Design a protein around this ligand. Structure first.
Ligand SMILES: O=C(NCc1cccc(O)c1)Nc1nc(-c2ccncc2)cs1
Lengths: 395, 396
């Protein structure tokens, strides 16, 4: 009323853009961007930087930093960064940490995916979406510290098991509940593949966005990478929007399920080609290019769900509703129910060992360059600005 | 015993902290103010960023303490970086004194850093001997400092209207002494305290003000700087050399001011006074000779002694071994008070007042009625706001 209350309701509360973490990101961002020999030729800047020297050194120290965390495995690697499995050093607790690279991400692929990425995992409030516990940053990377997924991604699964239409019905189902959850928030998940499908201790499936692609050495070519999503799982419309023709919606994730389901059943991707161009071309050509072998079993109805997803946009299933998707005869069984599901017992329940247990995860390079960032300015470019307020806490 | 999370939470809650809630506001406000010109918005990073926070800082600037909080009464001085104004808080209706510093003038003159110890001393001192800072804040154009009104006027007004008995002299000099020791014990030095910076409150007792020139001590209790000044009359010999780059100087520089203040209350003139900057400067270096006392004026044998002892070379100067060799001075012996009861005792002048609004103990002034100067619209990023960020402070 007399307004020192009006004020400080903004001062601290999470969705206010003046919440303390924004303010700290602010002073911290300004400082990174101010501190440079060319810019210090400005007495104002130089003197500001001198007074704030010590006090921001301590800020960087007291706020959550990467060295607060011990790195166990680097599991998966991106164009824009990587995912590591980490352990907090004092709490001894396990997380999966995504490093987004500020440079590669702001730069010229642009596409600025991070607000969306972040906001989803933090506020989804869903069993189906992996949780964002903390986010922080420094002058190079963003860091999302998300809830840990002790089972593998589904890539590991398919590696060990030939997958029965039973399991294949089950995972597609949780993915469907995962996809509406996100869509209900107005978000396009926008890259959906076995790699982002994760399994908790119950062998129940959660959805993520990670460091990604495949493999070393360019044979059994595993080409992947590029810019957005992944080559195998993209839509014709996502291709065409790059691209530069049209614009694509959440319809794109359903195409992806179609492809994912083709992979568990057939053991291969629908559009897989030697090169990525042979792959992009097949996809535009999906009408002619999409085929099955024979292909017993592959139940009629699964070939039908697949072809429902793998069609052109506005005729494709799930454009009218996720409802239309569940009615599909392919989900027909007495095992579980749509609203019950995650209560039911999952095909694969991972064999424990310890909290660390790494076997559901690989070992990687752990090497090299500290690759490029934001070349050193001769004037003030405010490159750290666009990430202000990205630091986030558990409450 | 304190987890890092906490230190930071506490760090945002402390007025003495520069990272606290208001400070980071100033910081963000700054970036907005200095980053926003159509030329700079040509950058997407900047442009995108302004549009995001822009309006929301206008939410802050309105509910911030702002100039409009305060109804201006009389102008109680003009210090060439701005003016002191007697003000009323339009809501609490509590009555304060408020100093104003042009952001533009300083930036023009460099001279952008001197107000930190001035606010630092006034807010944190918690002393009967020091004018208190209730608030500090800014808008684009100026700073503001809101202080406790000191209704009795300064010593220059007093000395003008009275012939000063050595007992009055003892009193005032004594409160100045304690006032200086308060500031010394924070670790500052007044660096030219003069009777202008000596103010009297409702009851007739004394407090120090206008702390801008204060220098924060370090190791050996010394300091130095190139800094441009005005009014040499009260300034020590070592402090004068300290421009020109000669040497360092201590807090013994402040004790000099006291022998000058003492000589000036009894004598009616300054000891080194002259019609020039040079004559006074040189009169000062020449203090061994230049210092004399009138025929017409018979001042007590230990009153001269006190003046003389403050008025010597730094290494021989009273105050150098402590504040106690001072208090223990024969000029300080007397039946009417002892050091400890001294603010609890009765003033030689208690001001009789018509209001809380009485201007009658100061000189009267009005305004420019004249132009105000703008920071030009900048080419690149400039940062003329940066030196003022963190200047916001409140009291609770
Ligand atoms: O703040 C000053 N300095 C005088 C001045 C004026 C304008 C611009 C300047 O750069 C300097 N002396 C002080 N006087 C008080 C005070 C408190 C209560 N009642 C009367 C005066 C505080 S600081």
């Amino acid at each position: 009323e007399t307004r020192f209350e009006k004020m400080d309701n903004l001062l601290r509360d999470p969705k206010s853009e003046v919440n303390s973490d924004c303010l700290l990101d602010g002073l911290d961002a300004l400082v990174y961007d101010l501190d440079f020999p060319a810019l210090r030729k400005n007495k104002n800047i130089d003197n500001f930087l001198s007074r704030y020297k010590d006090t921001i050194n301590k800020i960087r120290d007291l706020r959550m930093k990467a060295e607060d965390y011990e790195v166990v495995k680097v599991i998966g690697r991106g164009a824009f960064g990587e995912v590591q499995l980490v352990r907090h050093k004092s709490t001894r607790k396990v997380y999966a940490m995504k490093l987004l690279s500020k440079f590669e991400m702001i730069k010229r692929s642009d596409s600025a995916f991070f607000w969306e990425e972040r906001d989803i995992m933090a506020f989804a409030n869903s069993p189906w979406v992996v949780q964002l516990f903390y986010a922080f940053q420094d002058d190079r990377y963003l860091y999302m510290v998300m809830e840990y997924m002790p089972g593998g991604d589904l890539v590991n699964l398919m590696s060990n098991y030939d997958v029965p239409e039973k399991w294949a019905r089950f995972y597609t189902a949780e993915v469907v509940l995962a996809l509406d959850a996100i869509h209900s928030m107005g978000f396009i998940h926008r890259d959906v593949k076995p790699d982002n499908m994760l399994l908790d201790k119950s062998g129940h499936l959660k959805l993520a966005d990670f460091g990604t692609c495949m493999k070393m050495n360019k044979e059994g070519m595993v080409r992947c990478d590029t810019a957005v999503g992944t080559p195998d799982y993209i839509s014709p419309e996502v291709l065409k929007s790059q691209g530069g023709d049209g614009y694509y919606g959440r319809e794109c994730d359903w195409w992806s399920v179609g492809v994912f389901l083709y992979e568990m059943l057939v053991g291969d991707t629908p559009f897989y080609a030697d090169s990525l161009v042979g792959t992009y071309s097949k996809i535009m050509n999906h009408k002619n290019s999409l085929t099955f072998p024979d292909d017993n079993d592959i139940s009629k109805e699964a070939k039908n769900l697949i072809c429902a997803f793998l069609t052109d946009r506005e005729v494709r299933l799930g454009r009218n509703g996720v409802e239309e998707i569940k009615r599909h005869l392919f989900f027909k069984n007495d095992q579980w129910a749509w609203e019950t599901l995650r209560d039911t017992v999952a095909p694969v329940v991972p064999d424990l060992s310890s909290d660390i247990d790494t076997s559901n995860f690989d070992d990687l390079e752990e090497d090299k360059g500290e690759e490029e960032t934001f070349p050193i300015p001769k004037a003030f470019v405010g490159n750290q600005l666009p990430f202000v307020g990205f630091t986030y806490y558990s409450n």
